[PDB]
């Protein structure tokens, strides 16, 4: 199922809910052990991890260094070692069972820093920084390479993307997206890097484009019916699900589904309540 963790709806949230695209109904599971929005989620070894973010509450606004692990058949969260720095609006990707935490902000500071988590060792290690400071960055893994896409450097929103090579431990700028996107949904469907929605500094976007590594080309595809940034994104049985977000006026509960064979989007569900800035993964 599609798990959604955290989010924001007048305050950061502890929610963990799971959607079943076949049956169409929502499970309510154990609450996070610190309310978080702007976090990222991934799955390693069937375990669901919640990385970074912040607790924006009536009483504070603390950026998060936490990594927390949910066990789907224990329905219980347990803490893992923290990161070197807090990373609000972080991006994460999974290569070879290891979690990469990318970018994000701590207060005024927009990180270019990147670090790696070792599940069976529960250790973080600092690795080569990005060429670019990026928060609200989308991250994706293709051919065991790590891509950092778009985001916001503190001044400009970005259409640039760069690529991290784990065996060189090095970055490389690649071709820029056609659209400036911060807070987009970035994932890997079929064999392209998809970038859906986001915010270009003026409007939330409903456009969607995908990167083909072999031709180093971004192409536009079917756009979503609703503009959104700070959305959750995941692919389930070969189709893209985008989850909540913000359109400049309301917090979306709309969940859209992109069919790559028809190049069409359709609304399949509404989340239990509108929210933005969630961590999403499937397990």
């Amino acid at each position: 199922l599609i798990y959604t963790a955290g989010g924001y709806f007048r305050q950061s949230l502890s929610y963990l809910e799971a959607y079943n695209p076949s049956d169409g109904t929502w499970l309510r599971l154990a609450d996070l052990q610190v309310p978080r929005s702007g976090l990222a989620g991934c799955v390693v070894g069937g375990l669901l991890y919640a990385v970074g973010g912040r607790n924006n509450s009536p009483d504070g606004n603390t950026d998060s260094s936490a990594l927390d692990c949910y066990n789907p058949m224990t329905n219980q969260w347990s803490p893992c070692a923290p990161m070197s720095v807090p990373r609000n609006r972080i991006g994460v990707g999974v290569i070879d069972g290891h979690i990469y935490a990318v970018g994000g902000s701590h207060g005024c500071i927009h990180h270019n820093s990147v670090e790696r988590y070792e599940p069976e060792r529960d250790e973080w290690h600092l690795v080569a920084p990005m060429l670019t400071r990026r928060i609200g960055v989308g991250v994706a893994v293709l051919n065991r390479l790590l891509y950092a896409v778009g985001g916001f450097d503190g001044t400009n929103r970005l259409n640039s993307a760069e690529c991290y090579y784990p065996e060189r431990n090095e970055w490389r700028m690649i071709t820029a997206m056609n659209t400036i996107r911060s807070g987009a949904g970035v994932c890997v469907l079929h064999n392209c890097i998809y970038a859906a929605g986001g915010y270009d500094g003026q409007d939330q976007l409903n456009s969607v484009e995908r990167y083909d590594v072999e031709t180093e080309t971004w192409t536009f595809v079917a756009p979503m019916k609703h503009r959104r940034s700070a959305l959750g994104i995941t692919v389930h049985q070969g189709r893209i699900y985008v989850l909540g977000g913000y359109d400049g006026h309301t917090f979306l509960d709309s969940v859209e589904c992109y069919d790559p064979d028809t190049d069409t989007w359709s609304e399949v569900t509404r989340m239990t309540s509108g929210r933005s800035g969630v961590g999403v993964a499937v397990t």
Binding site: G38, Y199, A230, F251, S276
Partner: peptide
């Protein structure tokens, strides 16, 4: 803020 509503 325009991006996260947060």
């Amino acid at each position: 803020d325009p991006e996260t509503g947060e």
